Design a protein around this nucleic acid. Structure first.
Ligand SMILES: Nc1ncnc2c1ncn2[C@@H]1O[C@H](COP(=O)(O)OP(=O)(O)OP(=O)(O)O)[C@@H](O)[C@H]1O
Ligand SMILES: Nc1ncnc2c1ncn2[C@@H]1O[C@H](COP(=O)(O)OP(=O)(O)OP(=O)(O)O)[C@@H](O)[C@H]1O
Ligand code: NA
Ligand code: NA
Lengths: 227, 228, 220
RNA sequence: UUGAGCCUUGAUGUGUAGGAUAGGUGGGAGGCUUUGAAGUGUGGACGCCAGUCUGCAUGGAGCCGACCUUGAAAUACCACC
């Protein structure tokens, strides 16, 4: 059972995000129509909706790598964003040793004694820290990105499907790691258990119109009419 | 039926798995479970022959068409979706494309004509005439539109071509299915369709899955890969 | 109805005699038709494996009792050779590309090794229905004149069912028992000589002769 | 009473693009119905729920392949499965 826990270096107050008129589409036009929202601090926003629709590309626009058609996204002043992309190959195509790859993100005020502690908690013991970063398992890679988020210590976590290639032990450790998190969280998942365990607001998009909520997934289903 | 004897793969200075010897076969479905980094993908590579073991054997019958899954490649990207799912049948694909090449090159001489007649009868026996139709009746199940069935592999979306790569594996009822994490980044409806279409088949299937509700749904045996 | 009044009269369990089965079929010939008789044998082979496939064609000692226009598929001298053999088709590159492009088919196909206009033009029509000639089946013959006698002389082809059954027409209820017995024997001998190398078990399990509108019975 | 094997008889095995819930061989395509109809008057079973199978008849004596879109044709039917 890996020991994962995200902390927050500089807590930020009042609104953490605001999105004003974020219409965008690639070639179907209204991928999401006239989005308008304001995300407070401590929100755990689970963005649902399932398939081919802009379930992602919302996160990509929020981080900025996918320019929107119209609209402006105003992050908080000190907002530091930890991004866990759904497709994360580009950060491992470069072939560094696991130790160097985890050491890229060491911050001001920590050693390579403290660098290796994250890998130790992530169960990379003595030889699995000598492998090329390219040759690693899918779960052993998702964990290695979790250990980069932990190392950067963000105050806004955006995670595109953080439950990929992770066994029961990992989706039981990270679930409570994010539950103890004190900060802004934006995530997307399909399994009706991980999203239901930790969520205070649901924003799911349907290929005609977004629908927003203000409660957890159980109340969401009862209001939808699902037994 | 597939057998493996003393596979013993090792790169480093710690045992990975030792003297693995097991008979896979009989129509049973073996969910292969384990931790996040133990042996599963490098074991379904060995069972398909992608990499030979450090010292061991894998035995298969002279003709047993292994239907295995991707997610070690993404970039075929040279041809249409129909003829992309078709080439899951590595036997039929070669005869089809070779006879197309022969038709392209002039002329059908006596070497060419006698080289082609037997390939044509082989194609008929392999029922390539109704190959594209049965491929399309599966692409519709996966969720790809009929009007763009014939589009090339660049027309498809990056998040939509893993659907085609999944449909390739289970093309025409191939015995021994090597499924490596098939349900990842798939939806509830597609998962239900897949677990329904795998429930109507008599073909041993070794499946990697880290979830419980799919293994507990389809699988019969629960092969583990822990402790070595 | 007739199928309700003959089902009791004929039983499929009792493997009737070689002459008794034919006699019973002749007695039961009632439908107002020429009523071609057919024969179905159950070879013992594994159709899942290609090397145990039995593709063949032989000239029956009497004939099928029907005439089919053996369309010649050839070009050049080889295609023109069949014109003097008395065939019901004309072989040309255009005549197979345009004339044979929309044409359904002939009764059978001759083989031409010189011309090539009727090779890729068939496609779903020339191969999907099983009319394409192959060297083993004798359709792709070196000589159009040879194919004329191999098809117009009373030659019958056969390919396995997906479960390993060979059935084909043998004659008509007008034909006599003395002709039909040798007609069946020739086909049985042909299959016996055409048995593949790896044929486990007995390769002739059941032999049922039947009419179009009648039932069938085992003969051996 | 309940397992299993075997035999005999009957059903079930649409996604398009089709009239319509066509299994592959191919025998034929003009054959099925009056030892008493397609529809009707009315039962049950099955289902991707659109549609199929079956008792008997006051009356009952007429339905489909030919066309046609498909890689492929038809409960016109019998065949070996
Ligand atoms: N890089 C791209 N180039 C072109 N079109 C794209 C690109 N990325 C996405 N699209 C298009 O925009 C659509 C939105 O895809 P999106 O990432 O929102 O899907 P998703 O719901 O996250 O999918 P999945 O769960 O299958 O990963 C895609 O289906 C595709 O049509
Ligand atoms: N070239 C290599 N060098 C060193 N170690 C390697 C190499 N290739 C693979 N490995 C190791 O082999 C193991 C493979 O693990 P495996 O792929 O079975 O994990 P998984 O996440 O359970 O699988 P899956 O992706 O199939 O769900 C890992 O421990 C990985 O580090
Ligand atoms: Na996505
Ligand atoms: Na892997």
């Amino acid at each position: 059972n890996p020991f994962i826990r995200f902390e927050q270096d500089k807590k930020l107050f009042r609104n953490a995000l605001e999105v004003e008129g974020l219409t965008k589409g690639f070639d179907n036009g209204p991928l999401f129509k006239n989005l308008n929202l304001l995300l407070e601090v401590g929100e755990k926003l689970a963005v649902l909706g399932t398939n081919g629709v802009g379930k992602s590309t919302l996160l990509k626009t929020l981080v900025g790598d996918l320019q929107p058609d119209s609209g402006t996204v105003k992050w908080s002043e000190n907002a530091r964003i930890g991004y866990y992309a759904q497709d994360h190959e580009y950060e491992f195509e470069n072939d560094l040793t696991v130790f160097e790859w985890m050491s890229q993100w060491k911050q001001e005020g920590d050693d390579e004694q403290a660098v290796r502690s994250i890998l130790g908690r992530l169960l990379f013991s003595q030889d699995d820290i000598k492998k090329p970063a390219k040759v690693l398992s899918g779960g052993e890679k998702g964990r290695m990105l979790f250990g980069k988020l932990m190392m950067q210590k963000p105050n806004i976590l955006i995670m595109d499907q953080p439950t990929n290639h992770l066994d029961m032990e990992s989706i039981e450790s990270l679930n409570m790691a994010l539950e103890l998190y004190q900060g802004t969280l934006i995530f997307v998942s399909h399994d009706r258990e991980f999203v239901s365990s930790l969520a205070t607001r649901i924003l799911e998009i349907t290929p005609e119109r977004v629908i927003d909520f203000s409660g957890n997934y159980e109340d969401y289903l009862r209001s939808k009419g699902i037994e | 039926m597939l057998v493996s004897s003393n596979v013993t793969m090792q790169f480093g200075s710690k045992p990975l798995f030792e003297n693995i010897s097991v008979k896979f076969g009989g129509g049973n479905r073996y969910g292969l479970i384990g931790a996040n980094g133990s042996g599963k993908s490098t074991f379904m590579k060995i069972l398909g022959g992608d990499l030979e073991p450090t010292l061991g054997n894998v035995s298969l019958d002279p003709n047993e068409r292994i239907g295995k899954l991707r997610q070690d490649q993404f970039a075929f990207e040279e041809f249409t979706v129909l003829d992309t799912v078709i080439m899951g049948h590595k036997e039929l694909w070669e005869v089809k494309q070779e006879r197309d090449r022969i038709y392209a090159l002039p002329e059908m001489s006596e070497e060419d004509g006698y080289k082609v007649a037997d390939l044509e009868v082989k194609y008929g026996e392999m029922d390539g005439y109704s190959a594209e139709a049965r491929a399309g009746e599966l692409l519709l199940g996966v969720g790809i539109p009929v009007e763009q069935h014939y589009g090339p592999m660049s027309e498809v979306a990056p998040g939509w071509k893993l659907r085609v790569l999944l449909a390739q594996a289970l093309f025409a009822d191939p015995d021994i299915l090597l499924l490596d994490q098939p349900t990842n980044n798939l939806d509830i409806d597609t998962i239900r369709w897949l677990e329904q279409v795998l429930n109507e088949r008599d073909s041993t299937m070794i499946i990697i899955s880290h979830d419980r509700h799919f293994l507990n749904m389809v699988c019969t045996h629960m092969a583990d890969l822990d402790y070595g | 109805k007739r199928m309700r009044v003959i089902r009791e009269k004929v039983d499929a369990t009792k493997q009737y005699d070689i002459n008794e089965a034919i006699a019973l079929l002749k007695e039961l010939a009632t439908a107002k038709f020429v009523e071609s008789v057919d024969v179905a044998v159950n070879l013992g082979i594994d159709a899942r494996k290609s090397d145990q496939n039995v593709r063949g064609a032989t000239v029956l000692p009497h004939g099928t009792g029907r005439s089919v226009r053996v369309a010649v598929f050839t070009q050049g001298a080889n295609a023109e050779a069949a014109k003097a053999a008395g065939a019901e088709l004309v072989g040309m590159e255009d005549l197979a590309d345009q004339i044979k492009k929309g044409e359904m088919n002939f009764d059978v196909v001759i083989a031409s090794p010189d011309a090539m206009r009727v090779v890729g033009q068939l496609g779903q029509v020339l191969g999907p229905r099983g009319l394409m000639p192959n060297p083993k089946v004798g359709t792709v013959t070196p000589n159009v004149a040879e194919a004329v006698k191999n098809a117009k002389a009373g030659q019958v082809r056969y390919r396995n069912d997906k479960n390993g059954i060979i059935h084909t027409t043998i004659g008509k209820v007008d034909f006599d028992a003395d002709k039909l017995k040798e007609n069946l024997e020739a086909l049985l001998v042909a299959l016996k000589k055409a048995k593949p190398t790896q044929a486990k078990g007995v390769y002739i399990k059941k032999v049922s002769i039947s009419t179009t509108m009648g039932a069938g019975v085992a003969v051996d």
